[PDB]
Structure formats: C-alpha cells, structure tokens
Amino acid sequence: ATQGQVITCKAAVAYEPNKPLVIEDVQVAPPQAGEVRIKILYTALCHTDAYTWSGKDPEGLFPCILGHEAAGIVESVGEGVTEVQAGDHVIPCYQAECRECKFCKSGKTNLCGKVRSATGVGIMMNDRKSRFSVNGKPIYHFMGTSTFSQYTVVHDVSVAKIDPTAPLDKVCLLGCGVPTGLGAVWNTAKVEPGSNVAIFGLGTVGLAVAEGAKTAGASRIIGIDIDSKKYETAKKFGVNEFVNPKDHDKPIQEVIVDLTDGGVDYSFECIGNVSVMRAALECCHKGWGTSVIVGVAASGQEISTRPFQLVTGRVWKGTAFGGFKSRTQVPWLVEKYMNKEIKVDEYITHNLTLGEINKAFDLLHEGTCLRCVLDTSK
Amino acid sequence: ATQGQVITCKAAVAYEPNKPLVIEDVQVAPPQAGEVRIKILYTALCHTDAYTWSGKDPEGLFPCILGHEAAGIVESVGEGVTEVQAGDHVIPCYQAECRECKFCKSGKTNLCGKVRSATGVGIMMNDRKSRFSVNGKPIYHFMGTSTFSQYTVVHDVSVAKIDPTAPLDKVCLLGCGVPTGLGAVWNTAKVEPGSNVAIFGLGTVGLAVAEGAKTAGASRIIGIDIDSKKYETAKKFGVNEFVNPKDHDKPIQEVIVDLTDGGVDYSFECIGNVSVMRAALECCHKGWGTSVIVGVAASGQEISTRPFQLVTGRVWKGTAFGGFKSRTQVPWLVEKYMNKEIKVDEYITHNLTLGEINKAFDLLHEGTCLRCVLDTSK
Numbered sequence: 001a002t003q004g005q006v007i008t009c010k011a012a013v014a015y016e017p018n019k020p021l022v023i024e025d026v027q028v029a030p031p032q033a034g035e036v037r038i039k040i041l042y043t044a045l046c047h048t049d050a051y052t053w054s055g056k057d058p059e060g061l062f063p064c065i066l067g068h069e070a071a072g073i074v075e076s077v078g079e080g081v082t083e084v085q086a087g088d089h090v091i092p093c094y095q096a097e098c099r100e101c102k103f104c105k106s107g108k109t110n111l112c113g114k115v116r117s118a119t120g121v122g123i124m125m126n127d128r129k130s131r132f133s134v135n136g137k138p139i140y141h142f143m144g145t146s147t148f149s150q151y152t153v154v155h156d157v158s159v160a161k162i163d164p165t166a167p168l169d170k171v172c173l174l175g176c177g178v179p180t181g182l183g184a185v186w187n188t189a190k191v192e193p194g195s196n197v198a199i200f201g202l203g204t205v206g207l208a209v210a211e212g213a214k215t216a217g218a219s220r221i222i223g224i225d226i227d228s229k230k231y232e233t234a235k236k237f238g239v240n241e242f243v244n245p246k247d248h249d250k251p252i253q254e255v256i257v258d259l260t261d262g263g264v265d266y267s268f269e270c271i272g273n274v275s276v277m278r279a280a281l282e283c284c285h286k287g288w289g290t291s292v293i294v295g296v297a298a299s300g301q302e303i304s305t306r307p308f309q310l311v312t313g314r315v316w317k318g319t320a321f322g323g324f325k326s327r328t329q330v331p332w333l334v335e336k337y338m339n340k341e342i343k344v345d346e347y348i349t350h351n352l353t354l355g356e357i358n359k360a361f362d363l364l365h366e367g368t369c370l371r372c373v374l375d376t377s378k
Numbered sequence: 379a380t381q382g383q384v385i386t387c388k389a390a391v392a393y394e395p396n397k398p399l400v401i402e403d404v405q406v407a408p409p410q411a412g413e414v415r416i417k418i419l420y421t422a423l424c425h426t427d428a429y430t431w432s433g434k435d436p437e438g439l440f441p442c443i444l445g446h447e448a449a450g451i452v453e454s455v456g457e458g459v460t461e462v463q464a465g466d467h468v469i470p471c472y473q474a475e476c477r478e479c480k481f482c483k484s485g486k487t488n489l490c491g492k493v494r495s496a497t498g499v500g501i502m503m504n505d506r507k508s509r510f511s512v513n514g515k516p517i518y519h520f521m522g523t524s525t526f527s528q529y530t531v532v533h534d535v536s537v538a539k540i541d542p543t544a545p546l547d548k549v550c551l552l553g554c555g556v557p558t559g560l561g562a563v564w565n566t567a568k569v570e571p572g573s574n575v576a577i578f579g580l581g582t583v584g585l586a587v588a589e590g591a592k593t594a595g596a597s598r599i600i601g602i603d604i605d606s607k608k609y610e611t612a613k614k615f616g617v618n619e620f621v622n623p624k625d626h627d628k629p630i631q632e633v634i635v636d637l638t639d640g641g642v643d644y645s646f647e648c649i650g651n652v653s654v655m656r657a658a659l660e661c662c663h664k665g666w667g668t669s670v671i672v673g674v675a676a677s678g679q680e681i682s683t684r685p686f687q688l689v690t691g692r693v694w695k696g697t698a699f700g701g702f703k704s705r706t707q708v709p710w711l712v713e714k715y716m717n718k719e720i721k722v723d724e725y726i727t728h729n730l731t732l733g734e735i736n737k738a739f740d741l742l743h744e745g746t747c748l749r750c751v752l753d754t755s756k
C-alpha cells in the first residue's frame with residue numbers, strides 16, 4: 001500500500017529561473033485533512049508554466065514543481081474528503097470551488113477564495129507547508145496543482161471528478177485554455193446566434209473562443225494574429241475571416257470597424273497585451289458591442305480608452321477560467337467532449353514524455369505549437 | 379397670429395467663447411419640413427452648455443444660441459409634422475428618436491442617428507441653414523435645441539409631447555440630467571433590490587442616481603463628494619452614507635472597499651473626471667461589481683485600470699441619457715413626476731430670468747446650486 005505513506009517518484013523540479021528543469025526522485029507526503037493525492041498520468045504545458053519558469057511571475061517561488069493542466073487517478077484522500085476516493089479519474093484545477101465561501105454562495109461569480117492564501121505561496125492550507133521534498137528540503141507547489149510529477153497533492157476543493165472512460169491524454173487540456181475560451185463565449189459574453197465576433201490571438205485560447213463562438217451560432221468569426229500561418233490552422237476551429245495587423249498601416253481597431261461597417265458584436269482579447277486589449281474594445285460596435293479580456297497582462301501594465309467608448313454603449317469585461325465553476329463544470333465539459341460536442345484532440349499538436357520536458361519547453365516558441373501533452377510514466 | 383412669419387424675440391447669444399452672453403432681439407424663422415417651432419417658457423442650464431461656452435468644446439461654433447434643457451408650447455409645425463401640433467406642451471431633446479434608423483430599429487441602444495449631420499454643425503436638415511439671425515447675420519443652433527431663447531426651431535424627431543397640465547418650470551429638467559441619473563440605475567445598470575451602490579459626485583446627476591437607486595431598492599447608497607456640504611442635501615434624494623475623499627490619506631477606491639468589506643455592487647461616476655472614473659471601477663466588488671460612467675470627460679482624456687480588475691469580474695459601462703428613448707420615454711417620466719413617483723422640484727435651487735443668464739453661469743460655480751431655472755419672459 002502507498003496509503004498513508006511517503007511516495008517516491010519522478011518530478012520535474014525548477015530550481016532556478018531559466019535553468020533546465022531537473023528530473024528528480026522527490027518525496028511526496030501523504031494527504032492531510034481535505035487533501036487528495038493524485039497519480040498524474042498526463043500533463044500538458046503552456047506558457048503560464050513557462051512564464052513562471054522564466055523568472056517573470058511575481059508569485060514564482062523556487063525550487064518548485066510547475067504544471068497546472070493534467071489528468072490522473074486518485075491514489076488516496078486525506079481525512080474528511082468525501083467527493084472523490086481512490087481510483088477516481090480526476091482533473092486537478094488551479095481554480096477551486098469550495099461551495100461555501102461568499103463568492104461561491106453569491107451565484108454571481110466562479111471565483112473562490114478558499115485556498116488561494118496557501119496555493120498562491122506554494123504551500124498547503126492544512127499546515128502551511130509543502131508536500132514535496134528532495135533530500136529533506138521542501139519544494140514549492142505551483143498554482144495548487146504541481147502536475148509536472150508522477151504524483152501530486154492538491155486541495156479537495158480543487159479536484160474535478162470526471163468520466164472514468166474519458167482518455168486522460170486528451171482531457172488534461174480541460175484544466176486551462178479550452179474551458180477558458182469556450183466559457184468566455186458561453187458564460188461571460190453570452191454570444192447569441194448571428195453575432196459577429198473578433199478574436200485577437202489565435203493560440204489555444206483564441207482557437208477555443210472560435211470553437212465556442214461557432215458552437216453558439218456566430219456569423220462572422222474574424223481572427224487577428226501577427227503570425228499569418230495561424231489562419232489555415234484556425235479555420236477548422238471556426239475562424240472564417242483573418243487579418244494580420246502587419247498588413248495595415250491604420251490601427252487594427254479601425255480595420256475591423258471598416259470590415260464590419262461599425263464594429264463587431266463581441267471581441268475577445270486572447271494574448272495579454274494592453275494595447276491589443278484597447279484595440280479589441282474599440283472595434284466593438286457602438287450602442288451594444290462588448291469586449292472580453294481573456295489574456296493576462298504583466299504586472300503594472302494598464303488598459304486605457306477614452307470614456308466616450310463606454311458612454312456610447314460598449315461594455316468592457318473579462319473572464320477567469322471562462323466563468324466555469326471547476327468542480328461542477330469541468331466534468332460537464334468532459335461529458336461534452338465524450339459526446340463529440342467540443343473539440344479537445346485538435347489542440348494537441350505534440351506528444352512527449354515528462355523526461356523530455358525541456359524539449360517540450362523548446363516547442364512553446366514554435367508558431368505551429370498549440371498544446372504539448374506529456375506522458376509522466378517515462 | 380405668428381404661423382408662417384418670422385418671429386422677433388429675446389435670446390441670449392454667445393458671440394465667442396468665454397464672453398458674457400448678449401441678450402438680443404433675434405429673428406426666428408418659420409419651421410420647414412419636419413420642423414417644430416416652440417415657445418420656450420423655462421430653460422435650465424448645465425455643464426454641457428458651459429463646456430461649449432467656455433471654449434472647451436471642439437464642436438464649438440459661434441455665434442450660437444446655447445441651451446438644451448427646456449419646456450414649452452408648440453407655436454407651429456412644418457410640412458409633414460404629425461406627432462405634435464400647435465398648442466402641444468413639449469420638451470425638446472438633444473437626443474433624437476427617429477424610430478427608423480439602424481440604431482433606433484436595433485432595440486439594443488438609445489443612440490439615433492437621423493439629424494446629427496445638421497445638429498452637429500448648428501443648422502437644420504431641411505436646407506442646411508440656421509433658423510436664427512440677428513441684423514440679418516446667421517446665429518448657429520446648439521445641440522439641436524437652442525433653448526436660451528423665447529422661441530426655437532427643432533427637428534420633429536427631437537420633440538417629446540408631454541402632459542399639458544405638467545408645470546413647465548419644473549419638467550424642463552426632464553430632457554437632461556434627471557433622466558440620465560435615473561436611467562443609469564434603471565436601464566444601464568439594472569440595479570436590484572438590496573444592492574450596495576457608490577455614487578461619485580452629488581450634483582443633479584448624482585442625486586438622480588441616488589433617487590434611482592433608492593427607488594430600485596438599494597441598501598447602502600454611499601455618496602462621495604469633495605464638498606461635504608453636499609451630503610445634507612443628498613440625504614433626501616436617498617444617499618445614506620457619505621465620504622469626502624479629502625478626509626482620507628488613502629485613495630478613495632481603497633476607502634470604499636474598506637467601508638464595504640470588498641466593494642460595492644454598482645458604482646456610478648457623475649462628475650466627468652477620468653481619475654474618479656477609475657476609482658469608481660476599482661471600488662466595485664470582485665467577481666460581479668459594475669461601474670457606470672455617467673460623467674462626460676474632457677475631449678482626449680483617457681480612462682485607465684489594470685485589466686486584472688475586469689478579468690476578476692468587474693464590468694465597465696457607461697450611459698447616454700440614462701438609456702431612455704427621448705420621444706417615447708420623456709413623456710413617461712413626466713407622468714411619473716405628475717404621479718409623485720419621481721422628484722423634479724427638489725433639484726431646482728435657483729430661479730432667475732433669461733435676462734439674468736450671465737448670473738446663472740456664475741451660479742454654476744456655486745456649491746449650493748443644483749439646477750437654475752430661467753423664466754424666458756424677461
């Protein structure tokens with residue numbers, strides 16, 4: 001039995017920014033009250049991992065085990081945990097759903113405050129310490145998930161129980177970019193049939209917005225990206241018009257307004273660039289257009305516009321995980337995937353192993369790369 | 379009888395920015411196709427008039443007859459005019475409602491449309507000339523209204539027909555500030571019973587927000603003003619807590635978040651100050667708070683925030699004329715007033731004559747002045 005015992009396993013440890021990750025045998029402590037220990041079978045990576053690895057995350061603490069997009073099988077649960085048990089298939093989520101805080105009970109938001117005071121500084125709530133160690137020294141958790149590892153320990157309030165027949169090498173993507181994009185359309189914007197939409201940035205997030213908009217019945221789905229090779233890829237996801245800002249001297253907002261005789265019904269910024277966020281708002285139609293910020297700006301960066309943009313009827317909003325409540329709705333997303341109503345496989349452009357994680361990180365710089373999934377068994 | 383004749387009457391003319399208005403006899407030409415000539419009995423003044431008069435307006439065309447808040451009686455109508463006739467009591471409105479343009483037909487906005495190509499450059503649609511002259515030299519219209527005169531000519535699409543028993547020296551306020559503040563609450567924000575609200579600026583607009591919020595069922599109605607004398611006044615309008623930012627070292631948004639354990643459900647900026655607009659966004663509650671810009675900022679000034687504010691669930695909006703459709707809904711607001719369901723009288727702190735209009739502009743500096751109503755007979 002591994003039950004109640006320390007597990008020794010392989011993990012990719014980031015000891016310093018910009019140094020290659022080291023595959024180590026780490027000690028993974030057993031789960032304390034309200035905790036779940038998960039055997040991670042597959043983990044994806046994205047630029048959020050890379051940002052922290054690169055030393056730019058104000059919350060980054062080293063050494064740490066990165067990774068926040070994964071799916072595995074519960075090994076063991078700690079005292080009091082009732083919603084999952086050993087053997088359940090699960091997606092650990094970086095956004096919790098406690099069901100008991102003011103945010104959860106509001107019915108007006110998917111934010112949840114419950115464990116953020118621990119997860120944001122790389123530790124567990126129960127004892128304000130890590131469950132990972134190498135040579136008896138602690139290793140920080142990351143985003144409450146730490147999925148670059150054969151085993152992790154997470155808060156129960158962050159574990160989504162999923163269909164046990166769903167392929168774990170695909171549904172790992174339902175912990176980040178795909179829900180955020182779909183949900184930006186379906187939950188945050190509530191895009192109606194016939195709407196015209198602009199999507200700025202055609203990475204995994206922007207491609208999931210395109211899928212969500214297409215599914216919701218949008219008409220024009222105009223993609224905007226500085227890399228023109230993104231368009232052929234994006235077509236399959238629903239983008240049906242394309243503009244590269246580099247092909248126009250006029251501000252991209254002015255180009256989209258011209259193209260649409262006044263602007264779009266909804267826009268989505270899927271990059272993290274405050275200038276492009278402004279452009280996204282300014283290309284929305286007067287009277288009713290709504291812009292949704294999905295990208296995450298760097299610390300200290302600000303969005304600006306002239307207030308007449310809002311006085312004359314444009315609405316500025318943003319989204320966190322697409323407005324989805326993680327424990328309740330990630331499983332539903334998995335169901336939709338199993339019934340072929342959402343795409344997941346099409347976002348997975350590469351498959352490597354945890355051992356090749358440094359090689360995976362090198363792929364993030366390639367324009368053709370959407371998500372890369374890692375098999376943690378080797 | 380005066381129908382078909384040029385009328386000679388008193389008007390206050392602005393010959394250039396920043397000089398006292400000249401009370402002159404002027405010639406008011408008869409109405410042409412789709413026009414209405416109105417005997418104005420009472421007109422108020424506001425910031426919008428002063429913005430142009432002071433030379434701050436970029437549209438600023440001189441010489442002109444300023445004024446946009448008024449009530450009167452129709453003296454005659456032009457060819458094709460069917461919805462009003464001689465003897466009707468009316469409020470001319472700077473916001474048109476044609477019912478026939480893409481915006482009027484949309485059902486998603488109040489922002490017509492139909493006569494701006496003329497009103498925006500001080501003339502009439504039918505012949506692209508002005509109806510006003512002095513000594514044979516044209517005087518431009520303003521805002522499609524020009525109500526600082528005993529008679530004016532306005533496009534039919536801008537004329538609200540109202541209860542002929544309503545007092546014209548009170549309902550002259552129902553073409554600008556009072557509707558904007560009420561509707562910002564009822565139409566733009568859709569404030570729910572039990573909401574907590576912050577209102578930045580307790581002039582006529584902010585007090586109208588207070589009354590809208592109180593009527594909608596709001597709980598905490600927190601007023602913020604740099605003039606603490608404004609509070610005692612605001613209480614009757616519904617304001618039930620007050621903060622003067624000068625009494626705090628911390629930025630006002632931080633004070634308001636501390637006072638409300640996280641922020642308000644809705645905020646309203648009722649000043650026109652881009653820094654305050656930002657504060658009003660940043661004092662909204664995480665996950666759901668919405669801020670509505672009601673204030674009109676100087677041309678060129680930008681609003682800014684960090685986009686994490688919107689990603690974590692605050693929504694930034696703004697309003698034009700409180701979302702009310704002028705011709706349809708101004709008569710409804712008059713009905714509400716006559717049935718004692720909305721305040722109007724209480725916003726009128728001073729009464730002067732058109733002869734005294736320069737003293738009225740002086741009162742716009744007066745902390746004690748909300749609206750000043752001018753009797754055009756002298």
Ligand SMILES: NC(=O)c1ccc[n+]([C@@H]2O[C@H](COP(=O)([O-])OP(=O)(O)OC[C@H]3O[C@@H](n4cnc5c(N)ncnc54)[C@H](O)[C@@H]3O)[C@@H](O)[C@H]2O)c1
Pocket residue numbers: 046047048176177180200201202203204205206224225226227230245270271272273276293294295296297319320321322370689
């Ligand atoms: N709000 C949330 O809850 C949430 C969750 C996940 C990811 N995100 C954010 O979404 C963003 C997108 O992530 P991703 O994994 O899709 O990123 P990505 O790197 O795969 O894609 C970004 C795309 O933007 C394009 N781009 C860059 N600069 C551009 C510009 N100036 N104009 C137009 N296109 C431009 C790139 O060519 C690329 O196609 C990131 O900021 C990420 O942090 C947000």
Ligand SMILES: NC(=O)c1ccc[n+]([C@@H]2O[C@H](COP(=O)([O-])OP(=O)(O)OC[C@H]3O[C@@H](n4cnc5c(N)ncnc54)[C@H](O)[C@@H]3O)[C@@H](O)[C@H]2O)c1
Pocket residue numbers: 311424425426554555558578579580581582583584602603604605608623648649650651654671672673674675697698699700747748
């Ligand atoms: N959106 C629209 O359709 C529309 C229509 C009418 C008026 N407006 C605008 O609404 C705004 C207010 O008009 P009003 O007639 O009520 O103005 P007002 O001058 O009577 O009132 C402004 C109030 O704000 C206060 N104030 C000034 N600076 C402040 C600060 N830094 N912090 C807190 N309080 C401050 C003043 O003390 C005053 O009490 C104006 O900008 C006007 O242009 C908008």
Ligand SMILES: [Zn+2]
Pocket residue numbers: 045046047048049068069176177
């Ligand atoms: Zn991710």
Ligand SMILES: [Zn+2]
Pocket residue numbers: 096097098099100101102103104111112113114
């Ligand atoms: Zn919670």
Ligand SMILES: [Zn+2]
Pocket residue numbers: 423424425426427446447554555
């Ligand atoms: Zn006004």
Ligand SMILES: [Zn+2]
Pocket residue numbers: 474475476477478479480481482483490491492
């Ligand atoms: Zn119209």
